[PDB]
Ligand binder design. Structure first.
Ligand SMILES: COc1c(O)ccc2c1cc([N+](=O)[O-])c1c(C(=O)O)cc3c(c12)OCO3
Length: 121
């Protein structure tokens, strides 16, 4: 759920998931349209694609557990859904920190209306 994902984000980036990544660009948030604004936005686009490929699960609401070994996130082996959701979240949180050097304040609170057109995964 957003609880676990938000925790990963804070641990990896040092930024509170909300509002740093909840209204960023075209894909970091509820929205999902247009061309990703930058690397960080692409992390969210990919994250959406990952969630979109878990039709048999409830990514935003399903709770799961994970731990950290040797400084890296390790998804606990729970149900198939919990494991997959965890992996989608892990990849995104890491993607966020790997791209913090191009994170731009101007894309925060980005207006959804500026994002149009479906972009295939
Ligand atoms: C399905 O999509 C999304 C992504 O691809 C990437 C990130 C988020 C996302 C959807 C969220 N909501 O809203 O859907 C959400 C939320 C929220 O619930 O408040 C809070 C956050 C997020 C996201 O990142 C940091 O803090």
């Amino acid at each position: 759920s957003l609880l676990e994902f938000g925790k990963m984000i804070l641990e990896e980036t040092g930024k509170l998931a909300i509002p740093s990544y909840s209204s960023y660009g075209c894909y970091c948030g509820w929205g999902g349209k247009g061309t990703p604004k930058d690397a960080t936005d692409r992390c969210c686009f990919v994250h959406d694609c990952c969630y979109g490929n878990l039709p048999d699960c409830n990514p935003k609401s399903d709770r799961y557990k994970y731990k950290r070994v040797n400084g890296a996130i390790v998804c606990e082996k729970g149900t198939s859904c919990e494991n997959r959701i965890c992996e989608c979240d892990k990849a995104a949180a890491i993607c966020f920190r790997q791209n913090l050097n191009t994170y731009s304040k101007k894309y925060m609170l980005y207006p959804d209306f500026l994002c149009k057109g479906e972009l295939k995964c």
